[PDB]
Amino acid sequence: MDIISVALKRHSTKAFDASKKLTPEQAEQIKTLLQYSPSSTNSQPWHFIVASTEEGKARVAKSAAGNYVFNERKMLDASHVVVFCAKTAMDDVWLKLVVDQEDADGRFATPEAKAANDKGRKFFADMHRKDLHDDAEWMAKQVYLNVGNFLLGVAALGLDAVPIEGFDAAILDAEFGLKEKGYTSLVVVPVGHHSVEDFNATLPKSRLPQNITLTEV
């Protein structure tokens, strides 16, 4: 199906059917989407928690407390639930892991080619960590980009999903000990098939007119 039709027809699912699970093939496909998203300098400043078991989804759902109880059932009824996490700080060890992996994958023709890439990555990494002091935000933006790629991708797979910011990140981070591991949760994305209670499945989509948001030059 044409990608624009996918974009115009997908929606944020409000209720999922707990008896409908992803096929083993789709389960593998969503992980592929997560891994291959692009990122600034191929920095991949992220970690993903994919909850597919009843106990796993229950642990994530704990973060939907208080003013967020409305998002709890979404996390519990979906087939799979993805927690998008961003590193809390950019360290040289990670920078080395990335360029060594690119080297292992065969992207460099010579040693100086690898040296240049690393020097380049380091340059922009330091601009954010040392000059602007905003590497935390910088990395989080990369995670949000991944989320955007993911939502369109799952929709193109014929699966329902919903992006969720309505959860307590302090609770979720603690539930999985993310802080001490060097990460923090940003977005939760339940994936599966919608249920009869998905009131948003029949409502028309709505966006501002391009005459407001877009300028052609």
Added chain:
Amino acid sequence: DIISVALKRHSTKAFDASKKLTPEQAEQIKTLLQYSPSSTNSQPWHFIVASTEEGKARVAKSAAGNYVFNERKMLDASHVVVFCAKTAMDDVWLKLVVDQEDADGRFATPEAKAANDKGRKFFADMHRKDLHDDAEWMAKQVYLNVGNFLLGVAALGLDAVPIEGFDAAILDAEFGLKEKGYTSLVVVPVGHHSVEDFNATLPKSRLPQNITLTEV
């Protein structure tokens, strides 16, 4: 099919200046920009689509300094999209959004519309008043739009490259964004790669899932 698109796309390093988007594609990329999801459907963004040589020139002025390596990508691509985010979430915009949702018929009653507005303001206030991370929150939504865009244009059979290597202060001034209430975050040239695109034939590389992903 979408997985193949994801694995085959790549960041284009050089574009063929004589290859332009078809009229249809040029309209399709705008639809992609408009229809991206966003928290509370806040749509805290603005897009500049440069397709003329004069326009692309204006945007390319931001690729100076140690960013000159990105200048040619901006001049040779068929179309160049500048992704901008609001600098502050104002009540007028919140009203604009709910009014549009109303016009689009998403509300069965005035109460439902009020409930929707109340809910949106709760999270808008949480960022604007409680956390003071208003600007970052909106910027994040813009990056989500970019992610949606890159996959989408690839699915359309178009080449592109996301670019952070540019001077935002310079770009903002060239288009007088600061005064209009916006700021540039990422530039995305779109078109078709040239034989000079060395990245078109290099293997793609990503960290292993055994390090980045945990199954529970």
